[PDB]
Structures are given as C-alpha cells and as structure tokens.
C-alpha cells in the first residue's frame, strides 16, 4: 500500500562532486622527468627540449659494451644473472670499458700485440786500440 514519507525539513543533502575531465589519462614517460633531472643538476640556465632525448640515446650506448661483456662473463661462468664479480672482470679486462667508466684514458701510446723492435740508445764510438810508443 502507501510508502513512508520523507522528512519535511529542507537542506541536509550531500553536495554533488565536481565532474571529472573528458580527456583520457595518458601513460607516464620518463624523458619529461629527465628534463627536470638536468634542471636539478643545474648544468646551465635553461635545458633544451632535445637535450634529455639526445642524452637518453648517449646513455643507452654508455653501458651497452659493459652489458655485452658482463653478459659474456655470466654465460662463460654458467650464471643465470649478471652479478658484481662479472663487472669487476669486464671493466678491468677491457680498456674501452676503462674509458666508459669514470676517468677517460689516453687512446694513443696503447700497447700493440705484435712485438715492436727495441729502440737501442745511440752508441758512442767504440774505443779503438790507442797508438803506443
């Protein structure tokens, strides 16, 4: 039969929430944060939009040979993962990795595998038999 009546008193209702945006939520990409990391580093007055992009490309290659040789060391030692011991080997045993890590070493004057001729000092004139009396 008849339904129960609502209270005669006005107000006391919950306020309506503000409508959410129509535009769909994008994914977080890292290069927009790398721009801010360069700014936090304070390398110069302004960071160009291309700078973090070009530096991301540089960064990829800066350990590519480290990863290659450390993964070779892991395969050789029959390991499932790369560990610090593979890096201790890979770094010390390859001079291009000694250049990639920290202080750049001088490229020229590097040791060649073929035995080089010994540069003898300039010999003085040998003392000939002195003229007697």
Mark 22-51 with x for binding to another protein (rule: CB under 8 A) and - for no binding.
Answer: xx-x--xxxx-xx--x---x-xxxxxx-xx
Query: Measured on CA atoms in the order 36, 30, 63, 108, is the torsion positive or negative?
Result: negative
For another protein, the closer of residues 67 and 93 by Cβ is 67
Query: In the window 86-125, what residues touch another protein (CB under 8 A)?
Result: 86-87, 91, 96, 99-102, 104, 107
> 38 CB contacts (<8 Å, ≥6 apart)?
47, 51, 52, 55
Among the listed residues 113, 110, 65, 112, the one whose alpha carbon sits nearest the alpha carbon of residue 90: 65
Three-class SS state of 35: helix
* Cα distance between residue 89 and residue 10, in whole Å: 79
Among 4, 14, 16, 58, binds another protein (CB under 8 A): 58
Among 81, 123, 127, 131, binds another protein (CB under 8 A): 81
For another protein, the closer of residues 49 and 118 by Cβ is 49
Q: According to the binding rule CB under 8 A, does residue 21 interact with another protein?
A: yes
- Residues binding another protein: what is the number (CB under 8 A)? 56
């Amino acid at each position: 039969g008849p339904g129960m009546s609502g209270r005669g008193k006005q107000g006391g209702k919950a306020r309506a929430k503000a409508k959410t945006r129509s535009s769909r939520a994008g994914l977080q990409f890292p290069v927009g944060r790398v721009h801010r990391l360069l700014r936090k580093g304070n390398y110069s007055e302004r960071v160009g939009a291309g700078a973090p992009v070009y530096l991301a490309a540089v960064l990829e290659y800066l350990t590519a040979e480290i990863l290659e040789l450390a993964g070779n060391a892991a395969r050789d030692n029959k390991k499932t993962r790369i560990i610090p011991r593979h890096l201790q080997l890979a770094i010390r045993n390859d001079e291009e990795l000694n250049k990639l890590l920290g202080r750049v070493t001088i490229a020229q004057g590097g040791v060649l595998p073929n035995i080089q001729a010994v540069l003898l000092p300039k010999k003085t004139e040998s003392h000939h038999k002195a003229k007697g009396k």
